Structures are given as C-alpha cells and as structure tokens.
Amino acid sequence: EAEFVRICSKSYLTLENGKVFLTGGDLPALDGARVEFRCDPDFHLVGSSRSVCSQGQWSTPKPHCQVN
C-alpha cells in the first residue's frame, strides 16, 4: 500500500577519522547511489573504499584506515 522504502544503511554516511562522499542519491531516492570513502590526511584507506547502495544494502561495508 505504501511500505517505507528500504533505504540502505544511513550509518555509512558518517565515518570516523575521515569523510564520506555521496553522489547520485538522496532519500527518498538513490537509483543505485555511489559513495567514495577517504580518511583525513594521515590515514590511508585500505579496504572497502568503494561502496554502492543496492537492494537496501551497500556492496561493501566499512573499511579501515591506518595511520601513517
């Protein structure tokens, strides 16, 4: 009838020791929104840097940034 859209986890939006970049997506919309991860100028991202919303779930979860 009008079930709420199963938008992907919003938690991913926020990231400690870094910043999350959103593009082509925003409730109540996303059309397979893509997001690029990148930590502060000191920690190098070595994991699920790239992630995209799909079927109410992101392809890759939260990665891990290591201090130089």
Curated annotation (Swiss-Prot):
Subcellular localization(s) per the UniProt record: Cell membrane; Postsynaptic cell membrane; Cell projection, Dendrite; Perikaryon
Expression tissues: Ubiquitously expressed in tissues including the forebrain, cerebellum, eye, atrium, ventricle, lung, stomach, small intestine, colon, liver, spleen, kidney, urinary bladder and skeletal muscle. Expressed at low levels in testis, and more highly in brain regions.
Residue ranges of every copy of the Sushi domain listed in the record: 6-67
Domain of life: Eukaryota
Domain comment, as recorded: Alpha-helical parts of the C-terminal intracellular region mediate heterodimeric interaction with GABBR2. The linker region between the transmembrane domain 3 (TM3) and the transmembrane domain 4 (TM4) probably plays a role in the specificity for G-protein coupling.
Reported function: Component of a heterodimeric G-protein coupled receptor for GABA, formed by GABBR1 and GABBR2. Within the heterodimeric GABA receptor, only GABBR1 seems to bind agonists, while GABBR2 mediates coupling to G proteins. Ligand binding causes a conformation change that triggers signaling via guanine nucleotide-binding proteins (G proteins) and modulates the activity of down-stream effectors, such as adenylate cyclase.
Family: Belongs to the G-protein coupled receptor 3 family. GABA-B receptor subfamily.
Name of the protein: Gamma-aminobutyric acid type B receptor subunit 1
Source species taxonomy: Eukaryota, Metazoa, Chordata, Craniata, Vertebrata
Positions spanned in the full protein: 96 to 159 of 960
